[PDB]
Write a protein that binds this ligand. Structure first.
Ligand SMILES: Nc1ncnc2c1ncn2[C@@H]1O[C@H](COP(=O)(O)OP(=O)(O)O)[C@@H](O)[C@H]1O
Ligand SMILES: [Mg+2]
Ligand SMILES: [Mg+2]
Ligand SMILES: [Mg+2]
Length: 1290
């Protein structure tokens, strides 16, 4: 390895492994050929750069070399041709770096200052000109995040040491107001005239010049994004002053319906009442996991990250998740995120080779990415954050819209060049932590989380490129968890997330919220960029940080908690009685900030918006080119309608072990569930539900109708879940608009009024949380002309509710038992076609849209559904939304893998309008014998005239719609289901391994697929551990975790149910002597993402054990005892595979590497239990049942065929993926990762150690299995693993 001077440090260069698989190499060659670049070949290798502060001895060097050997064993090539090295841009530090460097330090290599990675490309193309070489270089990197170098030695530039930049004053006293005008422009403060006035007067009064940092702080605090001026403005509309601000109209909902609300409008989440259940966590004193019966209240929040996503979609989406997760954890005095939701709105995809007939290229700004690139990289970023942090992502939306329409401001382009990138979720919170505490004078003021850099300052446009490190956030969440788990002894007095404005907002808002001042020391803040100015330090929008206040006497406890989780923290100030803000700098011996808080936090006048109504005249839908058959095909091809698998299986849906209802439904795992449901605890059937409603294109015709439909659809999506009182349902209202665009402002007011003053109070729905994003428009020059793309007003409503029994949830999976299909048409026969999917796919807007037709009937629908749910009278439910009744029926037939025979003669003479309107309502399926009773029930709620018997679900493949004796539409259901799949197919195909995309798609066309199905070799209800549990003797299990691991609570709970005392054992506990494995007879290594999988999944964890001789010895000793048991699941499996030199009987084990799909796979996969020595699978051999899978590096990799054959002949294979026909498979996704012979679990020769990629601990509860046979009780088959362990111990 290479090793040269790099300032007071030395940089080593270490070559890594091949970086690209053959499909990705071929994609690059095809792109160069399409661009007329004659490239003969391309080969890529990772290269690593280690900046060292001191030398490595030979042992240390071999350890560093070994740390940097990872990943799939692709065949190495001798470098040939031109080197292009792609690295992060100078001045940036990759999240890869942060994690890789933590691993080096936890392996005892303190001499590593920083590790970084690049990709060396070797291109053979002897005939290219210098210009053509620039296009090659352009193709090989992201211009927003990366740079191209011609030498490996050039990477020295990434580690340059910079001295701190000083504070700069702005010379108001020496130049007058012009100094503030110049700074306004130079610093991009975007100050209004009245804000310059305020600053001029404030600093004139103080008799000194403002520092740059003070102006920047002020400017960030007074932005639209931070201050919410529009939502607090007075209004005049069509010449009349209005009596309430938008915010006041939202609050009207809480004034009307306070019921069940614990916190609204006073934290960065709302809280509502949950259920009393067993909250499960490890005690601070004993480290044992135990249930604590108490209220688990429910917090909720939804945010957006629209602007940055248009510039750099992966970090835009990722930090959109990240910031929202921080709002949750910083609710009250600390709380715990549980589950997430995700939303995207973009312009037309225009997928190459799959362009649809409604799509026209209108151009875009050069500086933004395309809709397609947002829907490629954005979902992967948001999913990487949720996956790595560890919260399941269980509901969402994805809308495309880009058309030239005759809307409120006449003919113009309406769309989403600036996208909607929405992230939300729910969490649980303790009752006594809901209220933020008071901040005592002298409280210590702390930054919890990552060392900062000059990122995102004030929100090419590099300042819009964010940076995501979910593992850092998980480490912080663990600390928050330890704090709230101390109950009365929770040392957090107050906590807030660090978002816009960075510390410059978060710290002043924290002390101000306590009625205190603060004094701070700049040099106590953790930095990863020593060159930063005070302005940059204070104002940067670095991620994964929280601010909180702790009593000084609690610092030693806080320090212990942080050090055990490896969460970085710094005490950076003290709360003061005086309401003043001081920031000192010990390096420069000066005071960058010195301001009264009332000066800093003082406000210019309230805004007044004086505006006028515009309203579009609709035009009747021109039906010339429309036929029913062509419309069905088009609508199924609209992304908004079409199958969403590309957005679903990339995100974990099982972590926590509390997921009851995820997107995928039934044996064929079709993503049509209308809402998400989680259990409240690991020991309850009480729970929580989440749904979304949204209908933006309607706002191009009618602003209020669009907002009423968003609320209505949230209710119809949630309605077949057992909740009871509608007042249990709480909403977030997220408002996206192009404020100032003609007609939008009045429309915004009318829409807010429609829901806040009218619909929500009448229904009894509170909106206790919300947000707004008010510049949803993009402008650019397109040839000679000014062009503009403006969003419709886009309200997204998320609904959240406590659930009475998660078991009683209905899905769209039709039964073929004798049945009746009933439409509930809340449209009352209006059958509106304006602003539908139908209109859109023929490039039109139409006349009049749907709307809430009858408030009482909407409420009646909800209450009727709740009565039907609780009385178990529904077989299925699916609501009507995009694509109308047609799509509702279709989706039900897809989920039930069956046919329908329905008649629509009662729905009007206009069959197109009957099938494609998007009025509220839906289809219930009931047992035939219950039809009359169900109809009578609906009639009691005032709905008889809305209710229509359609027909029946039938076995087979026919989708038939009649009207009297005429066939209106008839098609193969398989044909329809494959058309509906084509969008996800094509997205998967361009994003992932196209072989896998193709396999997945083509399998959907085989109607003989029987779906997931079970074969059981044992009695799943027989608690073979009961006689042991009945003695009260409970063996310990070490539930092993590492920084970044999120799977440990539910792993503990599985062993707890089998009779174990589950002990929390962090790798810091072993390294610090607090736990020794000699005290345990069983160990489990848990899944998740230790170190964000950097340096190969499980490798850093394993090598941290191997390279500490003491801890290595401990592990070896444990594994060589005669009766000990060990289990490794997912990340634990990977870790243990990398530790196999310590494990007897493991010489034939494989490695676990990148899935063949090249994509994370969150699947509910069918496995069979195979004959092997494994003690943990005793009694289960020959069983076949599904299991949760959630991994990106689960592919079994062997050295050669000799190795595979030996492993197989030894008989150590314990689980294999099978297809639904029951055969061992390598076809995707039945086998999700490409493992040979379906291998996904191995054991040792003595059977005492078993490792597996799937997660049995996430599915030991029947209620947590996405699909399961109806006759199962509480226990799934997988419970037997943990029971076997207990019985084995005796
Ligand atoms: N962006 C997304 N991320 C994850 N899941 C999504 C996303 N968009 C849609 N889904 C899921 O795919 C399924 C179909 O979505 P959609 O048709 O938009 O729902 P609906 O029409 O019932 O409102 C649902 O289970 C939904 O939660
Ligand atoms: Mg839909
Ligand atoms: Mg729905
Ligand atoms: Mg929807």
């Amino acid at each position: 390895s290479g090793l040269v001077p790099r300032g007071s440090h030395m940089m080593e260069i270490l070559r890594g492994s091949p970086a690209l698989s053959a499909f990705r190499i071929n994609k690059l060659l095809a792109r160069f050929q399409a661009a007329n670049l004659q490239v003969h070949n391309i080969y890529a290798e990772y290269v690593h750069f280690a900046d060292l502060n001191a030398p490595l001895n030979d042992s240390e060097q071999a350890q560093l070399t070994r740390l940097l050997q990872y990943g799939p064993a692709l065949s190495s090539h001798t470098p040939a041709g031109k080197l292009l090295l792609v690295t992060p841009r100078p001045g940036t530090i990759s999240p890869w770096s942060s994690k890789a460097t933590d691993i080096a330090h936890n392996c005892g290599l303190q001499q590593v200052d920083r590790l970084e990675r690049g990709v060396a490309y070797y291109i053979e193309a002897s005939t290219l000109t210098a210009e053509q070489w620039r296009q090659v270089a352009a193709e090989l990197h992201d211009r927003m995040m990366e740079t191209v170098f011609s030498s490996l030695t050039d990477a020295e530039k990434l580690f340059i040491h910079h001295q701190p930049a000083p504070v700069s004053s702005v010379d108001l006293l020496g130049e007058g107001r012009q100094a503030l005008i110049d700074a306004n422009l130079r610093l991009g403060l975007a100050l209004a005239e009245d804000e310059i006035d305020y600053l001029q007067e404030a600093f004139t009064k103080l008799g000194r010049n403002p520092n740059d940092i003070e102006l920047y702080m002020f400017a960030q605090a007074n932005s639209e994004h931070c201050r919410h001026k529009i939502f607090n403005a007075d209004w005049i509309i069509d010449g009349k002053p209005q009596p309430k601000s938008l915010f006041k109209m939202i609050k009207n909902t809480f004034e009307t319906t306070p019921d069940y609300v614990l916190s609204a409008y006073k934290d960065n989440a709302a809280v509502m009442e949950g259920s009393a259940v067993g909250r499960y966590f490890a005690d601070h004193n004993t480290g044992r996991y135990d249930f604590h019966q108490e209220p688990a209240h429910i917090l909720m929040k939804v945010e957006t990250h629209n602007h940055p996503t248009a510039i750099s979609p992966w970090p835009g989406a990722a930090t959109g998740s990240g910031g929202e997760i921080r709002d949750e954890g910083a609710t009250g005095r600390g709380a715990k995120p549980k589950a997430g939701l995700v939303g995207f709105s973009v312009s037309n995809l225009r997928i190459p080779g799959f362009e649809q007939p409604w799509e026209e290229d209108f151009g875009k700004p050069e500086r933004i990415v395309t809709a397609l690139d947002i829907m490629t990289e954005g979902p992967l970023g948001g999913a990487a954050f949720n996956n790595e942090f560890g919260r399941p992502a269980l509901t969402g939306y994805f809308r495309t819209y880009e058309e030239k329409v005759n809307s409120h401001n006449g003919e113009e382009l309406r769309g989403y060049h600036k996208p909607i990138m929405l992230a939300g979720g729910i969490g649980n919170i303790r009752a006594d932590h809901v209220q933020k505490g008071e901040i005592v004078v002298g409280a210590k003021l702390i930054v919890l989380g990552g060392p900062a850099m000059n990122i995102g300052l004030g929100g090419l446009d590099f300042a819009s490129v964010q940076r995501d490190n979910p593992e850092m956030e998980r480490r912080c969440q663990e600390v928050i968890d330890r704090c709230w788990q101390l109950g009365d002894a929770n040392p957090i007095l107050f906590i807030h997330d660090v978002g816009a404005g960075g510390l410059s907002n978060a710290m002043p808002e924290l002390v101000s919220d306590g009625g205190r001042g603060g004094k701070f020391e700049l040099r106590d803040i953790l930095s990863d960029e020593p060159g930063m100015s005070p302005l940059e330090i204070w104002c940067n929008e670095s991620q994964e940080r929280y601010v909180l206040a702790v009593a000084a006497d609690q610092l030693p406890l806080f320090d212990e908690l942080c050090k055990r989780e490896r969460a970085p923290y710094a005490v950076i100030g003290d709360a003061t009685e005086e309401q003043h803000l001081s920031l000192h700098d010990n390096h420069f011996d000066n005071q960058p900030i010195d301001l009264p808080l009332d000066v800093l936090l003082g406000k210019t006048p309230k805004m007044t918006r004086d505006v006028q109504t515009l309203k579009a005249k609709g035009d009747a839908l021109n039906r010339a080119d429309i036929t029913i058959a062509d419309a069905v095909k088009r609508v199924l091809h609209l992304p908004t309608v079409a199958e969403k698998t590309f957005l679903v299986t990339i995100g974990d849906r099982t972590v926590t072990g509390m997921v009851a209802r995820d997107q995928m439904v039934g044996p064929w795992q079709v993503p049509v569930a209308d809402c998400a449901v989680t259990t409240a605890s690991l020991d309850s059937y009480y729970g929580e539900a989440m749904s979304i409603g949204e209908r933006a294109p309607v706002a191009l015709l009618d602003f209020a109708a669009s907002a009423r439909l968003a609320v209505g659809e949230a209710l119809t999506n949630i309605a077949a879940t057992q909740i009871g009182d509608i007042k249990r349902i709480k909403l977030s209202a997220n408002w996206m608009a192009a404020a100032g665009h003609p007609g939008e402002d009045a429309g915004l007011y009318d829409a807010v009024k429609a829901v806040g003053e009218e619909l929500c109070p009448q229904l009894g729905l509170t909106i206790p949380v919300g947000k707004d994003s008010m510049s949803m428009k993009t402008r650019w020059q397109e040839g000679n002309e000014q062009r503009e793309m403006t969003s419709p007003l886009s309200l997204v409503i998320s609904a959240f509710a406590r659930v009475e029994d998660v078991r009683h949830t209905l899905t769209p999976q039709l039964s073929t038992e004798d049945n009746a299909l009933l439409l509930i048409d809340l449209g009352k026969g209006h059958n509106a076609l304006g602003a539908t999917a139908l209109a859109q796919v023929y490039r039109q807007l139409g006349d009049k849209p749907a709307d809430v037709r009858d408030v009482a009937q909407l409420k009646g629908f909800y209450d009727a559904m709740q009565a039907l749910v609780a009385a178990r009278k529904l077989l299925a439910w699916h609501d009507r939304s995009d694509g109308g009744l047609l799509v509702t029926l279709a989706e039900m037939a897809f989920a039930g893998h069956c046919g329908v025979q329905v008649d629509i003669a009662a729905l009007g003479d206009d069959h197109l309008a009957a099938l494609f309107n998007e009025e509220l309502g839906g289809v219930i399926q009931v047992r035939a014998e219950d039809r009359d009773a169900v109809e009578a029930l609906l009639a009691q709620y005032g709905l008889a005239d809305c209710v229509h018997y359609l027909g029946q679900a039938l076995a087979g493949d026919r989708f038939v719609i009649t009207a009297n004796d005429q066939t209106v539409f008839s098609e193969s259901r398989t044909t329809l289901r494959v058309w509906w799949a084509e969008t996800t197919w094509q997205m998967q195909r361009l994003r992932d391994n196209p072989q896998c995309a193709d396999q997945e798609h083509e399998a959907k066309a085989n109607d003989t697929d029987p779906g997931l199905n079970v074969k059981l070799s044992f009695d799943i209800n027989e608690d073979i551990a009961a006689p042991y549990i009945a003695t009260g003797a409970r063996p310990k299990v070490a539930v092993l975790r590492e920084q970044g691991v999120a799977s440990h609570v539910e792993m503990a709970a599985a062993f707890h149910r089998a009779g174990f005392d589950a002990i929390d054992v962090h790798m810091s506990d072993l390294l610090g002597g607090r736990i020794g494995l000699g005290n345990f007879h069983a160990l489990v290594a848990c899944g998740g993402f230790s170190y964000g999988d950097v340096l190969g999944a499980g490798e850093g964890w394993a090598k941290s054990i191997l390279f500490n001789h003491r801890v290595r010895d401990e592990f070896e000793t444990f594994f060589h005892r005669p009766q000990t048991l060990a289990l490794g699941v997912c990340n634990g499996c990977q870790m243990m595979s990398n530790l196999r030199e310590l494990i007897p009987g493991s010489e034939l084990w494989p490695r676990f590497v990148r899935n063949h799909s090249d994509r994370f796979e969150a699947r509910f996969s069918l496995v069979e239990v195979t004959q092997s020595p494994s003690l943990l699978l005793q009694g289960m051999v020959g069983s076949q049942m599904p299991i949760a899978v959630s991994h990106g590096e689960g592919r079994v990799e062997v050295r050669d065929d000799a190795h595979l054959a030996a492993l197989e002949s030894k008989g150590l294979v314990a689980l294999r993926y099978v297809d639904n026909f029951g055969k061992v498979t390598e076809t995707y996704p039945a086998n999700p990762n490409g493992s040979p012979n379906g291998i996904t679990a191995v054991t040792t020769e003595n059977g005492r150690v078993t490792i597996m990629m799937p997660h049995p601990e996430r599915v030991f509860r029947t209620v947590a299995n996405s699909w399961h046979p109806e006759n199962w009780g509480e226990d799934s088959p997988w419970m037997r693993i943990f029971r076997n362990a207990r019985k084995q111990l005796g």
